[PDB]
């Protein structure tokens, strides 16, 4: 039921993407136990990251790191060309009152003193990196700035997350609209005004609009859908793997951890799975 | 008379660039005293860099570095948004027998085990880097691979340099063509055919085709010109830069210079400009420095 | 009271370095507002860099860059031959649950897919670079691997940082031991035993062991001291540097600053020093710039 | 009969290397057809490079590139931990009169406006590089400067090549002496003076001294020999390999080269083996 669409509009002058990510954002919330404001920052990042990741091909993948000096600390999302995302926030426990407009105060959680970086991993010696300063802190506008100023593509990013009173996620989705080099300086203005006039993405997702519908409303025309794909929260961590974490400590600290408890545990930061090594298992190296 | 153009074609679905860089590549050859194979590697790199630079705006700028492990060492080119390039290679006097096609063996000079990287300065606190493997060593195809990797639109970079027996440059130029979204398949196979179907770019320049004409030839239609700009080899070094560096050595090292040599020649590695500090200049610096 | 020593031991067959860097790592923590795990990565890197720097002479200097792919991003440290370090991490507010040994999970912050590189400026036209894979992520072992790769003598780098619950630094220090040619096997197994047999370096510092005492403890004999030096966190940035950068933006961008903000804050990314340009200062710059 | 020794002296305070490279330098001369002055530059580079290469371990390897602006152009040598060297000069045809001292005028051939670089390849993302300016042009003293100033190890390099009237090589060999960190400022002076007083390496190789003997004369004591190994000119190029060169041109220039000659050739720059592709062979791609 979560998915992403790749689209064109205006006869190939607009390259567009849209997604519905309610289930994956709910899974992020549950795994990390984020408080509402942190959920909003997490889901906004996850959704934007997924759509960046969909711009990739094949086995290529990317990582977004945001750390604006606010109490949530660093937010990291991995996304790939298959629409698999894993993401965490460094401090899930962030509470503030609503802002003046009655929305979760994401910019106070994130902070605006630091950077948004995107690292694309194409192979062992092949990568593309980009970095800008966080100028908004609401995340959607920071991703816009990344696209416009580091990637130098005229773009508009909208991401929205609605949090239920019980702290679960009601809805999440977003879009990215990009104007291609060919676009005549006049059709640019038709789209820029219609974007500036349509309802914010949070309102659109509140009404239950699908990704195609969101693109149509925001664009003022039905888009050519190039591809739809399913998307999911996914983290490939496993116990064998955390072994290497534990191996990396050695035979000393390993002989300890035990002789003192008869066990040890390690935690995946992306998905919060916990791995317990029993006494027998720990002995299998020491 | 060297210059570059920015262009669209096929109702804005093709974005294109082209340049004639004979004079600037000749300046590089002259400054660094490259041998033919190395001039070809240097001038291909310069021309490709200039065109990437043309995709920037304002005061932005970029640096290309090729390090394939070959005898030429590193090839480094700075390019800004205003049509100015400076470039050097580690080892300018690099040359070989002609390759099996009777052309300059650029791949042998460059090496095929290493990377091509592009680092962009896009303003205070806006940063972009890319790095790809060298896949060819002939450079045109490497830049194509960098562009396709970077922007994931079909791209084609052509660059050429013809060198005279006296080691001077006879011609240099290039183009970049990129097919944006919504390019229909008729235009693709038009363009791809033309591409893998038309003459070498350095002979088009030698024939005296303009940048505009080259795009017409390659594209199959007259391009829409968005901008033309003069271009040149330029390094902003000056004697003052080197004076400052000599000062930073301290009195002792300077006095060594005066005593064993009576003078000092400082050389910019980017453009090989040579600056001479007389005994008296150096005495002034020894006495100025703390 | 932070300082570093240079030493020999076992009749000159062992070359050694040690430092107490509590205060400088505390300055880095404070400047950048690192969270515990990131302070440990930052301070380990700083201390290792300082000691590498101590192997240099004169005005020479070096830059360490760690890029393992982890959440902290890049860790960059400049170190000179005069005991001065500046360093930053991309993302200071990085932290996790304790690792399986109940210690700060530095490897998780750093990542284990990337490189550690060292670029040395050894004078006008003398250059040295090294780069190795990250093998651990815990940093001590990575620096050891860099040194063994570089000089091919048995080496050991220890570095530690203890952080308080309030995020301040309680202790930081380190050592490097290298076994030169002709070290007999009795001294090797002496040293290797001691090494893989003695307490953590950050607790030795907390206990209030000096650098000298730490080398004694690790080596099994009192070292011969060759040099002691004061050390510190220092970044030579100043408001003037940023003024110059603002000037370089042009009148228009500056006027935007004045109009939308009434002022401008410029921040050094190396040391996070914050410089404030009042409306009037900015008016001065807008009018000065061409 | 060519070989290299690894040594210590002065109870581990001196780390030393020496080699006899007459046969490999003769092979370089024959392959490239160097004229005498070029032979001297080539052999000096080969011998120094071999001894640098012996400092390496395992499968690690290095490349020395020298290009001083003189008529010989770029000199490149590869050397590995096994003492395999391959090396060429860009212009083998360099003639000058003898210098004032009656020796081949290597510095006029090489030139002193450019750099000596050494790249050590430890793996795909692992390398050490060093570069200095060429300050002598005679090569031995440039290698000394590389070791002293880039690698920061107090060192003395001696390399010598004697060329026969018939242009073949009569002798070639060299040494490197390094002073270790422990060396007391007084035993440094005993060695520095004895080095400054002994006969130049060309004279020593003229008299037929082996590597061990050269170390003993230059050191003033018999060295501890740690290892001896055989050394050779070796280049692993093959026809299959040059295929990739030719493949890298494509199917067009390939269809040509032929339809016009019925063949094509490519040449290894390091060893000057020539590879001929027949009409049938060229067709096996086009
Ligand atoms: Zn996980
Ligand atoms: Zn210059
Ligand atoms: Zn600073
Ligand atoms: Zn060969």
Burial class (CB in 10 A: 0-12, 13-18, 19+), C19: buried
d(CA D25, CA D173): 9
B279-288 helix and B251-261 helix, angle to the nearest 10 degrees: 160
d(CA B43, CA A4): 45
d(CA D158, CA D135): 16
The three-state DSSP-derived secondary structure of chain A is CCEEEEEEECCCCEEEEEEECHHHHHHHHHHHCCCHHHHHHHHHHHHHHHHHHCCCCCCCEEEEEEECCCCCCCEEEEEECCCEEEEEECCCCCCCCCCCCCCCCHHHHHCCCCEEEEEEEEECCEEEEEEEECCCCCCHHHHHHHHHHHCCCCEEEEEEEEECCCCCEEEEEEEEEEECCCCCCCHHHHHHHHHHHCCCHHHHHHCCCCHHHHHHHHHCCCCEEEEEEECEECCCCCHHHHHHHHHCCCCHHHHHHHHCCCEEEEECCCCCCEEEEEHHHHHCCC
End-to-end CA distance of chain D: 47
d(CA B161, CA A158): 47
Residues 6+ apart with CB under 8 A from D238: none
d(CA B176, CA B158): 6
Contacts B181 to A, Cβ<8 Å: 8, 12-13, 15, 180
Place of tokens 């002034």: B284
Neighbour count for residue D240 (Cβ, 10 Å): 8
d(CA C237, CA C245): 12
**B232-233 and A14-20 strand pairing:** unpaired
Tell me, in Å, the resolution of the deposited structure: 2.0
Closest chain C CA to residue D117: C127
d(CA C51, CA C80): 10
Place of tokens 């580690």: B90
CA atoms B93, B97, B102, B107: torsion sign: negative
Could you please state the CATH topology (level 3) that the domain comprising A235-286 is classified under: CBS domain Like (3.90.1280)
Give residue limits of the domains in chain D: 1-234, 235-286
Distance set, CA A29 to CA A76, A103, A211, B132, D239 (Å): 14, 18, 22, 37, 60
End-to-end CA distance of chain C: 49
Q: Rg of the Cα trace of chain C?
A: 21
Q: What are the tokens at B6?
A: 């920015």
Contacts D121 to A, Cβ<8 Å: none
Neighbour count for residue D279 (Cβ, 10 Å): 14
DSSP notation for B224-241: EEEEEEE-EE-----HHH
Of D65, D246, D267, the CB nearest to B73: D65
D22-32 helix and D36-53 helix, angle to the nearest 10 degrees: 130
Residue C113 — left, alpha, or beta (φ > 0 → left; ψ -120 to 50 → alpha)?
A: beta
- Give the CATH number of domain D1-234: 3.55.30.10
Ligand nearest the Cα atom of residue B271: 2
Residue A248 distance to chain D (closest CA, Å) = 21
Residues 6+ apart with CB under 8 A from B46: B21, B24, B25, B28, B77, B85, B87, B172, B233
Cβ-defined contact of B124 to C59 (cutoff 8 Å): no
Place of tokens 């408080």: A35
The DSSP output letter for B183 is -
Residues 6+ apart with CB under 8 A from D102: none
Q: Are C216 and C223 in contact (CB under 8 A)?
A: yes
Residue D202 distance to chain A (closest CA, Å) = 45
d(CA A15, CA A99): 33
Residue B233 distance to chain C (closest CA, Å) = 22
Decide whether D1-234 matches D235-286 in CATH topology. Answer: no
- Give residue C154's Cα distance to chain centre: 22
Q: How was this structure determined?
A: X-ray
The DSSP output letter for D200 is P
d(CA C222, CA C219): 8
Neighbour count for residue A128 (Cβ, 10 Å): 23
C22-32 helix and C36-53 helix, angle to the nearest 10 degrees: 130
Closest CA to D108 of D143, D140, D69, D61: D69
- Cβ-Cβ contacts under 8 Å between A and D: the total is 4
Q: Write b or e for each residue in D63-83: b if 16 or more Cβ atoms lie within 10 A of its Cβ, otherwise e.
A: bbbbbbbbbbbbbbbbbbbbb
The CATH homologous superfamily to which domain C235-290 belongs is HSP33 redox switch-like (3.90.1280.10)
d(CA C13, CA C10): 6
Distance set, CA B279 to CA A152, B257, B263, B265, B285 (Å): 51, 9, 5, 11, 10
Task: List residues of chain B with CB under 8 Å from any CB of chain D.
Answer: 33, 35, 69, 71-73, 90-97, 99-103, 107-108, 136-138, 196, 267
Q: Are D159 and D103 in contact (CB under 8 A)?
A: no
Residues 6+ apart with CB under 8 A from A244: none
């Amino acid at each position: 039921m979560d998915y992403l669409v790749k689209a064109l509009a205006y006869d190939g002058k607009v390259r567009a993407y849209a997604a519905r990510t309610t289930d994956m954002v709910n899974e992020g919330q549950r795994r990390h136990g984020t408080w509402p404001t942190a959920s909003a920052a997490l889901g906004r990042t996850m959704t934007a990251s997924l759509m960046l990741g969909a711009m990739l091909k094949g086995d290529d993948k990317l990582t977004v790191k945001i750390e604006g000096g606010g109490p949530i600390g660093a937010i990291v999302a991995d996304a790939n060309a298959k629409g698999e995302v894993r993401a965490y926030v460094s401090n899930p426990q962030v509470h503030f009152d609503l802002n003046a407009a009655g929305k979760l105060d994401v910019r106070r959680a994130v902070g605006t003193n630091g950077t948004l970086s995107v690292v694309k991993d194409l192979g062992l010696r092949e990568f593309f990196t980009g970095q800008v300063e966080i100028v908004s802190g609401e995340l959607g506008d920071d991703f816009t700035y990344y696209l416009v100023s580091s990637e130098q593509v005229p773009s508009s990013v909208g991401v929205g997350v609605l949090v239920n009173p019980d702290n679960t996620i009601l809805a999440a989705g977003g879009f990215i609209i990009q104007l291609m080099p060919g676009t005549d300086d006049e059709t640019i203005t038709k789209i820029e005004q219609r974007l500036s006039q349509v309802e914010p993405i949070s309102k659109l997702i509140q009404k239950g609009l699908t990704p195609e519908e969101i693109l149509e409303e925001v664009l003022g025309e039905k888009p050519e859908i190039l591809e739809t794909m399913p998307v999911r929260f996914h983290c490939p961590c496993s116990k064998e793997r955390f072994e290497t974490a534990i191996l990396g400590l050695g035979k000393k600290e390993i002989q300890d951890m035990i002789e003192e408890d008869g066990q040890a545990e390690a935690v995946c930061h992306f998905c919060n799975e916990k791995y317990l090594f029993t006494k027998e298992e720990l002995e299998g190296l020491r």
